[PDB]
Design a protein around this ligand. Structure first.
Ligand SMILES: O=C1CCCC2=C1C1(CCCCC1)N=C(Nc1nc3ccccc3o1)N2
Ligand SMILES: COc1ccc(Cl)cc1C(=O)NCC(C)C
Ligand SMILES: OC[C@H]1O[C@@H](O)[C@H](O)[C@@H](O)[C@H]1O
Length: 392
C-alpha cells in the first residue's frame, strides 16, 4: 500500500552506463529516454480515428549506446522481466534480406523500428536497454522501447520527417514484429509528452494539444492488477474488425463520422454486439471532448465522472474489462476524495487510472489493496516529458 519508487532519468542512465561499460569495455557515446503512458480517457478510440487524452509517465525506457563501423547490432537488456537471452546480435537488414521477428521477444521491438527506420545510411551500434515501465503491465512498455529505439536511430542517422511519421514507424514495428495491431496513441504520447501536460490527440487530423494538467491538490493514481488474460492479445484485433464492420455497414470512413443518432437509426444494419462496440466508441469520443473541456476549466468532478462513464462503457458495451479491473474500480470509487476511476489501456488486465485529492492517495492505496482479491501495484505520476536525448 505504498507507491513504488520511480527512478529518475539520471539514475536509470547511470545504471545503463555502468552496464554498457561492463559489457562493451568503453563508455557509451549516446543516451535516450522514452516514457510509458497512462490513458486518462478515450479508450478504443485511437484506431477509430477518435480522440485520446493520454499523459507520459515518470516510468521510462532508457537506451545508451555507440555507433559501430561493422554494420551489426549488439543489444543487452537489464530488465530481468525480459525473456532469455538478455543479449542479442544480428546484422543490419539489407535490400537482400530483412530482420525477422523471433526469440527473444523483447528484441522484436528494436528489430521492428530498425527494419522500418526511413533514413539511410543507418550504421550498426552497441546499446544497453533499461526500463522502469513494468513489462506488459498495460503502461506501454513496448511503445517506450520502440520510441527510445527510434530516438536513438535519429542520433545515428537523422530523419527529416514529422513526429507522426515516427509514431507510425514505431506502430508498424508493434504490428509486424510484435503482432499487436495497435493504434497511434502509445507511440504518439511517448514521442510528444510534456512535463505537466496531458496530450489531447485527434487520431483523425493528427492534431495534438498540450493541455495544462497541473494542480498540486490533485493526483493520478495508477493501479496495476498484475493480471493479463490471454484475450488482451486475441480480442484486441477482434474489436478492430467489429468496429471496421459497423463503419462498412454505415458507409462511414470511421466511427468518428458516426453519432449515436445515426447509429440508433441503423440498429437493423449491424449485430447486437456490433451496435454495442460502436455505442462505446461514439460515446467515448464524446466523453474525451467533454473531459478535455472539463480539464481546461478545472472541473475535476466532471472529469472523474466521465472517467466512471468510460469504464462502464468499456465493461458493458465494449466488454474489454475483467473482474480484477472491475474490483479495483469499485474499490477506488468507495474512497473519499476519489473523483473517478477506470481501466486504462487495452483491457483484460493491466492498470486502472484514478483521479483523486492528492491528500487521499494514501487512504486510496490502503483501501484498494485490502479490497483487491490479488496483489495490486501503485504509482503516483504527474505528467512527464516525451522522448529526450543526452549526448555522453
Ligand atoms: O509478452 C508480452 C505481450 C504484450 C506486452 C509485451 C510483453 C513483453 C514481451 C517481451 C518480454 C516480456 C513481456 N514485453 C513488452 N514490452 C517491453 N518493453 C521493454 C523495455 C525494455 C526491455 C524489455 C521490454 O519489453 N510488452
Ligand atoms: C488528470 O488530471 C486532472 C484532470 C482534471 C483536472 Cl480539472 C485537473 C487535473 C490535474 O490538474 N491534475 C494534476 C496532476 C496530478 C495531473
Ligand atoms: O484505448 C485502447 C488502446 O489499447 C492500447 O493498448 C493500444 O496500444 C492503443 O493503440 C489503443 O488502442
Amino acid at each position: 500500500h505504498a507507491a513504488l519508487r520511480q527512478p529518475q532519468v539520471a539514475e536509470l542512465l547511470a545504471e545503463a552506463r555502468r552496464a554498457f561499460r561492463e559489457e562493451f569495455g568503453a563508455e557509451p557515446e549516446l543516451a535516450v529516454s522514452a516514457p510509458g503512458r497512462v490513458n486518462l480517457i478515450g479508450e478504443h478510440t485511437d484506431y477509430n480515428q477518435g480522440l485520446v487524452l493520454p499523459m507520459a509517465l515518470e516510468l521510462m525506457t532508457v537506451l545508451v549506446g555507440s555507433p559501430r563501423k561493422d554494420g551489426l547490432v549488439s543489444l543487452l537488456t537489464t530488465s530481468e522481466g525480459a525473456d532469455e537471452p538478455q543479449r542479442l546480435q544480428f546484422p543490419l537488414p539489407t535490400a537482400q534480406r530483412s530482420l525477422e521477428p523471433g526469440t527473444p521477444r523483447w528484441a522484436n521491438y528494436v528489430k521492428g523500428v530498425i527494419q522500418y527506420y526511413p533514413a539511410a545510411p543507418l550504421p550498426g551500434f552497441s546499446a544497453v536497454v533499461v526500463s522502469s515501465v513494468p513489462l506488459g503491465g498495460g503502461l506501454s512498455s513496448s511503445a517506450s522501447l520502440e520510441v527510445a529505439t527510434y530516438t536513438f536511430l535519429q542520433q545515428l542517422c537523422p530523419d527529416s520527417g514529422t513526429i507522426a511519421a515516427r509514431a507510425q514507424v514505431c506502430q508498424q514495428a508493434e504490428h509486424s514484429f510484435a503482432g499487436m495491431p495497435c493504434g497511434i496513441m502509445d507511440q504518439f504520447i511517448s514521442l510528444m509528452g510534456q512535463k505537466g501536460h496531458a496530450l489531447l490527440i485527434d487520431c483523425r487530423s493528427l492534431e495534438t494539444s498540450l493541455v495544462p494538467l497541473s494542480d498540486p491538490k490533485l493526483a493520478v493514481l495508477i493501479t496495476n492488477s498484475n493480471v493479463r488474460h490471454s484475450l488482451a492479445s486475441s480480442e484486441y484485433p477482434v474489436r478492430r474488425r467489429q468496429c471496421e464492420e459497423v463503419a462498412r455497414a454505415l458507409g462511414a470512413a470511421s466511427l468518428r463520422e458516426v453519432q449515436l443518432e445515426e447509429l440508433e437509426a441503423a440498429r437493423d444494419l449491424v449485430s447486437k454486439e456490433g451496435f454495442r462496440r460502436a455505442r462505446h466508441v461514439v460515446g467515448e469520443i464524446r466523453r474525451t471532448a467533454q473531459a478535455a473541456a472539463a480539464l481546461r476549466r478545472g472541473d475535476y468532478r466532471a472529469f472523474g465522472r466521465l472517467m466512471v462513464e468510460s469504464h462502464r462503457s468499456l465493461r458493458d458495451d465494449y466488454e474489454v474489462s475483467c473482474p480484477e479491473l472491475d474490483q479495483l474500480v469499485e474499490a477506488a470509487l468507495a474512497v473519499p476524495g476519489v473523483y473517478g476511476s477506470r481501466m486504462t489501456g487495452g483491457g483484460f488486465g493491466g492498470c486502472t487510472v484514478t483521479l483523486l485529492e492528492a491528500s487521499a492517495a494514501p487512504h486510496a492505496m490502503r483501501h484498494i489493496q485490502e479490497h483487491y482479491g490479488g496483489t495490486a501495484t501503485f504509482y503516483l505520476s504527474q505528467a512527464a516529458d516525451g522522448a529526450k536525448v543526452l549526448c555522453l
